[PDB]
Amino acid sequence: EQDNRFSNKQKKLLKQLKFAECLEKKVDMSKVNLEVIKPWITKRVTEILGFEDDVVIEFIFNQLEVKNPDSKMMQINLTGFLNGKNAREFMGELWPLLLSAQENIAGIPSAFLEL
Amino acid sequence: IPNTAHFANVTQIEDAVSLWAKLKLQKASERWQPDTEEEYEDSSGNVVNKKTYEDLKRQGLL
Amino acid sequence: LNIGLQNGVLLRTVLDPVTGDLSDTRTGSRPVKLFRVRMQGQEAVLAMSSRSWLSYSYQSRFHLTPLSYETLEFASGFASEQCPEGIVAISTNTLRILALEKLGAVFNQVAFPLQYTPRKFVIHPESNNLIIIETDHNAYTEATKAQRKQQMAEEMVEAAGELAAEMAAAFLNENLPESIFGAPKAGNGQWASVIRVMNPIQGNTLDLVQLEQNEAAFSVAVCRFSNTGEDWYVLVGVAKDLILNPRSVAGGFVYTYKLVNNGEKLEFLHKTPVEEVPAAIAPFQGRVLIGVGKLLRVYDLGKKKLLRKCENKHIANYISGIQTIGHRVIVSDVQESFIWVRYKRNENQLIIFADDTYPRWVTTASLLDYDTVAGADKFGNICVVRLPPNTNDEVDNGASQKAEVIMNYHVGETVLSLQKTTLIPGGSESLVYTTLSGGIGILVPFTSHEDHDFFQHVEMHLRSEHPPLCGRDHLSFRSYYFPVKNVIDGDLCEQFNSMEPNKQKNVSEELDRTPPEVSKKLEDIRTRYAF
Amino acid sequence: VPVAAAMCVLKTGFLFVASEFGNHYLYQIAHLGDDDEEPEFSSAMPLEDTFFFQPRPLKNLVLVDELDSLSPILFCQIADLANEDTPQLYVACGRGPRSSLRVLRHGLE
Amino acid sequence: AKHHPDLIFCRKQAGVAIGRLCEKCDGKCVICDSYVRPCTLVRICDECNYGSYQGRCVICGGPGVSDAYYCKECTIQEKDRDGCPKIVNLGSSKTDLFYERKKYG
Amino acid sequence: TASAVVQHMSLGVYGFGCEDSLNHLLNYVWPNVFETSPHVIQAVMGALEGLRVAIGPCRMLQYCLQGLFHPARKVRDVYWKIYNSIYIGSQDALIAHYPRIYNDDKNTYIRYELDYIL
Amino acid sequence: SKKKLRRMNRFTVAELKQLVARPDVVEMHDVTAQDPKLLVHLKATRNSVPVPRHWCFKRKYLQGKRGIEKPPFELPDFIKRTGIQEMREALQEKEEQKTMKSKMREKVRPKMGKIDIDYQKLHDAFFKWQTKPKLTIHGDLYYEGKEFETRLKEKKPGDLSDELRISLGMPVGPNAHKVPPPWLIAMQRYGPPPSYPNLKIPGLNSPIPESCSFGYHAGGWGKPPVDETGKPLYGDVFGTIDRTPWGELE
Amino acid sequence: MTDRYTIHSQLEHLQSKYIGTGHADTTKWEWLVNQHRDSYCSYMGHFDLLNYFAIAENESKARVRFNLMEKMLQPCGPPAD
Ligand SMILES: [Zn+2]
Ligand SMILES: [Zn+2]
């Protein structure tokens, strides 16, 4: 904002991290039902953590409810709470499920279409 | 090949030669040779360079 | 009050119980006769001494302007239904009702139309006739225009339908003047050019040559080669297949015409091809210099084609202009600068002997004397460049001895024509430039450190107490590209008169003078060089 | 009308046109130009090609005034090509078919 | 102030609020740190002008008493065109001398 | 301290054509560009920006040109710092000053509008 | 190594010297530039100014200037004329004779108006006797040792000097032209030196310089060279527009 | 290391607040590309290079303006790779 002697650490990670695979196809949120996903997110993380962390839950929710989310930024922000590779796998697992739900006509992922 | 500035830091002889050749071509380009360019029309209105002009001039004809 | 004398002079004054302050000019050594006449919303005075000189305040501005007609004898105002306002003017064996038109003016115009953009013109000195080249990108030469108009009518006929419906005749007979509907012209590499010999008295066009479809005319010169007699020839450089923004050409030609019928009709002699657009031609000691791209060749007149008598290959970029004082040649190219060049006559050489220290997109030049050049810039600047006193005229980063730049000024608009000349009779020399937005200005030398210093102080104090209107800084403006050097702003100095007299007196007190003397000293300079 | 760098349609039914090169014009409006045998194009009308028209001299405008202007001055020369003792300015001027050669002299006509 | 490399400006967009000087700081420029030929007045960022920050020394931070100017040299090189020149950080020297004193007496 | 003198002297004599003097002193101030003392290097920087407004940006760019793409990197560091400071103030006056840089195989580096003749 | 791939890109110096249009410009390390074609093209542009010599030097800049001793600054002539120098010398020597006692005594009882200097001489010295020094043209950077270069490129014999003619046994001053250097005798004898076909000798190949005399006594210009027909051997040993400035103050 | 990325910091700042600056790692492409873009924005500001160009070709100032602003998105080829 006012300082020059510090670098943008986000951009630095934007260069120097190892990211997930589905993180390219931009995604909109109008086309999505979330309240179907929400329990999936909850159980996913709660297992990753062995306990429940409401704040991480709501963090992911709030980062998603935007018009179009940045998968890069989201993987970064979860890298702290989860163990880094867990974040890569988790995001590259949810984001394709997002693509599925969004090309679905009801907006729901094919996993819960089947189940 | 004259020990001039252009060949400093060149050490291999084949390189010095080749470079000297292209530099010969360069200076030849920028030089002005009247003998080859200066174009002369004869009394018959067609063009020669001044070389042939003076040639056939004193050669009894031009 | 106004007092005109009999050896043509007249002085104006205020009147209060004492004649306040005087001003004086001259109007031919013959009696200044005076006549009150109503003019354009004002009373004004005529004067006749040897020329009709109307004296009047234009929105409180005393301009004393000639008007253009023969000598006069007497006059006075006049009105009628036939003439809402005019002048009864009796002159040699005549009485005339005259009318004075547009009064807000310094020059008055008369326009002779043309067909395309005129890129250059030259005066033939005997018959006083203007040879004019004209060129237009992305156009159609006239022949081609009519031909392919015809051809599209050919297509249109073929609609196979009622045959009966013939818009052909209507099409080919309808002729929408381009002067009002625009030129029906397009293409991207398509040029269209023309030559025209015109008389300057009235717009009668003594002759008109029409070049082919993509032959574009870029330079013209009128000269006498010495190997023939007093035969005046006319040379016209012409590019062929030019493309503009990528750049490329097919190549140039130099058309030669004999300029016969005492100077009112061209006649083609020969076109000698050349390897790039000949953007500059100059007569030079009985032969002709020609810039061709980067090469600078000296040609002489051969009677099948032009002959290459000399050449230089060192000019930097692309020759845009060529001038010659008696034996020096100032080449001026498109991005570096002016380049001086010496013609070693007997040894037959063109040797570069000085150049410039700055990069500068010249668009025009003019020699002030043997040692000095003045140049304009594609960006708005004007410079004056001089050769240092001890230059070695004849010898035998990249140059030898450089030239010092002794003035620099940002005019504001591209200046495309400079010329050193005198305007009023008897008045002193000045350097007149004409911009590309329609402006005309002059630059005038100072003759006395006292003058120069008075004016330096006037403008220095105006800069501070009467700043530019829209926010800018005057010094920063005039130093837009290179900082100012040895020029003063008459346009800013002459805003004293429109300042508010409290401020007038503050400035004239910084000078320790009065607004009247300050204003008189503002206008004497204006008067001894220009209008 | 000439190509313009500004059209300023006043009240009083005047219309200023500031041509980009050459002289400026003050026109006066006569009719809003409607309901005649002139076609009318529309955004609901379909076509599969474009609709057309054909230009003609002025109908809705009458040229009231014309301001002279030297813009652009592609060349100039101060000479004495008359017999007068003063020099005239031979200005090669204007663009395109509106180009000109104007002679200027410090006088009044 | 051209003397202490450790400090920083607000640098955010200008405003209309004139700038003010403390009595220690009175009279000098704000960048050039000169003492002479002051030409133009200082205008400060609205944020750096809001609330408690009104009427203070741009440099010192104390109670502003006089209007801050720019020297003619800053005006000519156009260093007055960068938005709020308020130093937004205290520096080492203030707290340093303060602690040396509060230990001394 | 002679560099500080030159800074203030240029800012003062701006506009009066005392320019060959200032250029001559540029020839002596310029070699001090490879210094490392904070105070000597920022005195020289102040001098070069005073001289930019008084000598103009052409000269300053004729001085910065050859070292922007140098083999080394200390000299690229210094030259790009100087060039940035010439650029930031008077970045418009420079349009007329840049040098002609030819076009290679794939891109076109030449500005042709500036070679339109008219 | 991708570093060694960039190194595999690195032309040889003869590669560079070949491709570029001006090879002189190319130096050794120019090969190591991430843009060598640009770099050389920018080194070949007109009017630009080459990097300072000492970027590679291991010693710093005038830290190397170190060793020798130097004479004090030398005042301009127009400032010498006013005699401030000897004035301040007098006071320096007086005050060096002073001791601490007398120093404090004059601190407490000054000798006001002891000495003075007049104005109008300072005013003439700055506003009426000033002169432009010899300045340097654009691009003459300074380097350590530039000021201990005599000069060079001075190929002309006409250029004579004062120390030269003195230790030649020839006079300097206004009679320099009428003063023949020891070279003109054998110049008339066997031509000019055969690198200088194009040098003209004062008194031997050119006319007598004004008011100098052909002759063979002490101070003359000899018996001028000519052939057996009467044609001079070199040049002529016997001597067979409107340049006004345009806008200038009266 | 320290000085390296701290001046890399200050220069990222300079550039990002001032498009067009450089650093020790500036390529020929981006140099000349900023140089072109500035040239265009100034042909558009300056009311008289706009005339010069509109007269040199045969267009109108609005079309010339439009063309410049079209070119301003890739004036020198595609990027380096
Ligand atoms: Zn304070
Ligand atoms: Zn300041």
Ligand SMILES: [Zn+2]
């Ligand atoms: Zn702020």
